[PDB]
Design a protein around this ligand. Structure first.
Ligand SMILES: *N1CCC[C@@H]1[C@H](c1ccccc1)c1ccccc1OC
Ligand SMILES: *N1CCC[C@@H]1[C@H](c1ccccc1)c1ccccc1OC
Ligand SMILES: [Cl-]
Ligand SMILES: [Cl-]
Ligand code: NA
Ligand code: NA
Ligand code: NA
Ligand code: NA
Ligand code: NA
Ligand code: NA
Ligand code: NA
Lengths: 229, 7, 6, 229
């Protein structure tokens, strides 16, 4: 591949430059090349990988929603064709991320922080595929997302305190999955509420800076709860 | 849709 | 110096 | 090219969809395909072409400036290498636009307004190349930009009134070229001043909306004159 001849450290450095320049496609390509060196990512590097692909797929999802809305209201072939083009590119990015996770990053060995991070990510990218899927294909994709989130949840509850920001963000996204994808708003609401309440009870153990990190995500859980109820 | 983690 | 904005 | 098999009308339709979806690279590719059909563009279509490529090149210019600033402050090879990567991509987009103008938008333009519009665009895209060029290549690019702008000036003085917004915007950009690129502040000031005065003489003949259009661009000339004088 085009990054094969570049040093790992140079790929990381250029990913950071690409972020500063808001060149997220480049950022993702540099981070993919770094993953392909075969070494485990540090916490900082995991964040870089995630930010890069989040921004790439985020732009595609926003465009897909615009085009899908135009298409639904129109219902020549042009709107459908262009929506399909964007959809295929979005699916390609999701398949790229899922492939990196399965081929390189998800491991049975590993610290809880990385295992939960990557299983959550797998759930997220199956969720993005589910947003554009239909019929029975959608069913299988939904189950793949659920399974990844559930394994991440099980690890996070055993191996991380209830205020851990990664655990909290996983619960936030899994609850969004229940509400938006799986037609399970009651489960979404219950998960957000118990997660919020169990974090609030343990805030007293945290430093000022950890308190801010945890409460910022708790505030997102509350925002969704108050939206939904 | 409901907002997910912004990062 | 700024050019025409469009 | 890749758009050769798509109907012209479908390309225009998809360019407009891409704009709604903020997919400006797609928008530019669709408009390139439409140009390459070989028919003249309407006013609406040449504005779509200009908007699409301005968004693409504007993002590249902004990224190049971020990276150039980091590079300047740093004074490993990575910052320079990544700046060069973005630079090469920017040069490619400018070469693409210039190729459309030379083959064959300028020569096929059926009226003075559109010929001035395209010749101004040619000056602009050579100017963008000049911002990142060095040495003898930069000198050639500067002469090419000047020649395109000057031909546009000659036509606009013969064929369009001094308050016409396309004539005013040409003079604005050519004066910016003189000051920022060609190190000719005296020519920049002279051009902006003459343009400003010749437009003011005719402001009283204009409708309310045309007066607004013309004074808006006059104020852009004024802003530059204040910076320059
Ligand atoms: N979101 C998931 C992983 C990257 C990104 C994360 C974040 C999480 C919650 C709110 C904002 C940002 C992130 C991004 C960059 C640096 C650190 C970081 O989380 C630790
Ligand atoms: N800039 C030149 C060609 C497209 C764009 C132009 C414009 C010029 C000055 C201020 C705002 C916009 C433009 C863009 C979109 C529709 C019309 C239009 O001018 C006719
Ligand atoms: Cl298409
Ligand atoms: Cl590079
Ligand atoms: Na390698
Ligand atoms: Na632990
Ligand atoms: Na409940
Ligand atoms: Na709310
Ligand atoms: Na409420
Ligand atoms: Na006159
Ligand atoms: Na005058």
């Amino acid at each position: 591949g085009a990054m094969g001849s570049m040093e790992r450290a140079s790929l990381i450095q250029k990913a950071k430059l690409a972020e500063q320049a808001e060149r997220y496609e480049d950022m993702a390509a540099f981070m993919k090349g770094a993953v392909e060196k075969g070494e485990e990512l540090s916490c900082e590097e995991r964040n870089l990988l995630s930010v890069a692909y989040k921004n790439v797929v985020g732009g595609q999802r926003a465009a897909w929603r615009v085009l899908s809305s135009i298409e639904q209201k129109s219902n020549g072939p042009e709107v459908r064709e262009y929506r399909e083009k964007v959809e295929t590119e979005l699916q390609g990015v999701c398949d790229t991320v899922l492939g990196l996770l399965d081929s390189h990053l998800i491991k049975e060995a590993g610290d809880a922080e990385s295992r939960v991070f990557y299983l959550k990510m797998k759930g997220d990218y199956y969720r993005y595929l589910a947003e554009v899927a239909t019929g029975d294909d959608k069913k299988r994709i939904i189950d793949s997302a659920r399974s990844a989130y559930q394994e991440a949840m099980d690890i996070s509850k055993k191996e991380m305190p209830p205020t851990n920001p990664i655990r909290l963000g996983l619960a936030l996204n899994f609850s969004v999955f229940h509400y938006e994808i799986a037609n399970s708003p009651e489960e979404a609401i219950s998960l957000a509420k118990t997660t919020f309440d169990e974090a609030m009870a343990d805030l007293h153990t945290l430093s000022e800076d950890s308190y801010k990190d945890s409460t910022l995500i708790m505030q997102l859980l509350r925002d969704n709860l108050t939206l939904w109820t | 849709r409901t907002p997910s983690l912004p990062g | 110096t700024p050019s025409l904005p469009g």
